[PDB]
Amino acid sequence: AHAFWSTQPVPQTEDETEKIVFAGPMDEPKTVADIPEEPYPIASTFEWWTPNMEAADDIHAIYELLRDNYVEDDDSMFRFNYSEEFLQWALCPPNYIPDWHVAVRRKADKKLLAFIAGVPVTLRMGTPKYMKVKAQERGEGEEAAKYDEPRHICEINFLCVHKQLREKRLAPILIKEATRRVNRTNVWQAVYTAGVLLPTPYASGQYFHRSLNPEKLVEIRFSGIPAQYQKFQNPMAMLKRNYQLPSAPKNSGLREMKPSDVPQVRRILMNYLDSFDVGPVFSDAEISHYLLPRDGVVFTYVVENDKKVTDFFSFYRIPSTVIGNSNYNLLNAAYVHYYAATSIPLHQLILDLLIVAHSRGFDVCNMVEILDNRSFVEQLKFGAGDGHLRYYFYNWAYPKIKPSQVALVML
Ligand SMILES: CCCCCCCCCCCCCC(=O)SCCNC(=O)CCNC(=O)[C@H](O)C(C)(C)COP(=O)(O)OP(=O)(O)OC[C@H]1O[C@@H](n2cnc3c(N)ncnc32)[C@H](O)[C@@H]1OP(=O)(O)O
């Protein structure tokens, strides 16, 4: 019984979602004129605040809110610690809209208490290929193709309410106010992810994790000793051997991506992403923004053969605070980002990612089974995680799809 989500333009049940066969909007059309001009009222001790993401002190305030109050694991042993440089990167892509970053602060002391972020993305979100096949059989190809044009929508992330203000219905008001500012911009759909189940995902993918420093991961209780290893005299020793990696990449031609690589990377990435049912469309400027190496934030390598870029991979860094371990205070996680392989098997491309990440000091490589990520899980010794990432749209009916038909990486 969802007091807020039952009022919203999202499919309300799995049964409803299972019956959706065409993509399109949920709400009847509205105009900007239909949308309230003023921010929603809130308690007189609080005020709305739009952070200036180009101000180091505002980024620092957001940083500290998220550091202390953002996503924790179920046992409260790890908490995301997105860096300030990461936040400026994720929040300020090309043509970002400052007003879509919505915060609540306390009037008296100006303390930041809650936050939600939206950024523009151009997303292909038309009817899935297989549903189009079936629709053509029924003579409904026109209906199924109606919304194939890429759409300029909002991607929502970083929803966060201070631990002190939880379960006080602040999150719905934040979501409503974000929806209002986005609607006032003449944007009517959003895409978001969450590790929890809400009404109603169009896709869900399990997390997988590739141990790079298994001794640390066991010590901090990220991982355990698999039971099969208890047959050994020194299980940890054999675990370290199992996960051992070469010290250098195996692909001749691998090097860091350069600005001059952007056009070729854009071409091979878009060729790949275009084969998925849901996926972003990136300009040169967005490829540069999201993939050019940034110290401590995003790491991107290309394979060059005969003076042509034929493959690339990227990963980004999010450390987690380790809560209450005597020997470690941080978990250094690399997350598989976008990639594209044309000259080599994908598992060989991602093996070099693991090797590079290990050599740059990362403890674990994480991913969700979107893109073709599932296809190399066994080959490269990823293990299944406890968590799933659910993909949602706001104001968009969408048929259920497998995560392997999703090509949008969420930071
Ligand atoms: C066109 C433009 C549209 C733009 C908007 C598109 C939609 C965007 C939607 C948001 C996309 C976010 C994507 C991310 O960032 S996902 C990550 C979310 N953040 C965290 O998990 C950080 C740690 N947790 C918190 O900060 C709080 O617990 C949050 C803020 C999550 C809830 O605060 P609190 O614990 O103080 O609760 P409340 O009393 O204020 O509110 C209770 C209501 O909140 C619903 N709830 C709980 N968790 C989530 C969740 N993750 N997405 C959506 N709704 C959620 C819940 O079902 C209930 O509604 P209902 O069950 O009564 O109906």
Read off the tokens for 226. Answer: 């698999």
Domain range spanning residue 286?
Answer: 1-411
Ligand 1 neighbour 119 (Cβ under 6 A): no
Ligand 1 neighbour 176 (Cβ under 6 A): no
Beta bridge partners of 332: 319
Q: What are phi and psi of 335, to 5 degrees?
A: -115, 130
Q: Which of 337, 334, 346, 340 is nearest to 375 (CA)?
A: 346
289 CA distance to ligand 1 centroid (A)? 28
Q: What are phi and psi of 399, to 5 degrees?
A: -60, 145
Q: DSSP characters for 24-92?
A: B-SSPP--GGGS-SSPPP--TTEEEE---TT-HHHHHHHHHHHHHHS-B-TTSSEEE---HHHHHHHH-
Minimal-distance CA residue to ligand 1 atom 13: 157
Contact between 404 and 371 (Cβ < 8 Å): yes
Experimental method: X-ray
Read off the tokens for 177. Answer: 């106010």
What resolution in Å is listed for this PDB structure?
1.8
Contact between 148 and 127 (Cβ < 8 Å): yes
262 CA distance to ligand 1 centroid (A)? 36
Q: DSSP characters for 102-154?
A: EEEEETTT--EEEEEEEEEEEEE-S--HHHHHHHHHTT-HHHHHTT-S-EEEE
Q: How many domains does the chain have?
A: 1
Which pairing describes strands 364-368 and 279-280: parallel, antiparallel, or unpaired? unpaired
Best probe residue, ligand 1, of 80, 87, 157, 161 (max atoms within 8 Å of C-beta): 161
Minimal-distance CA residue to ligand 1 atom 5: 179
Rounded distance between C-alpha atoms, residue 155 and residue 157, angstroms: 7
Read off the tokens for 75. Answer: 């046992």
| Catalytic residue list | 411
Q: Give the distance from CA 289 to its chain's centroid.
A: 16
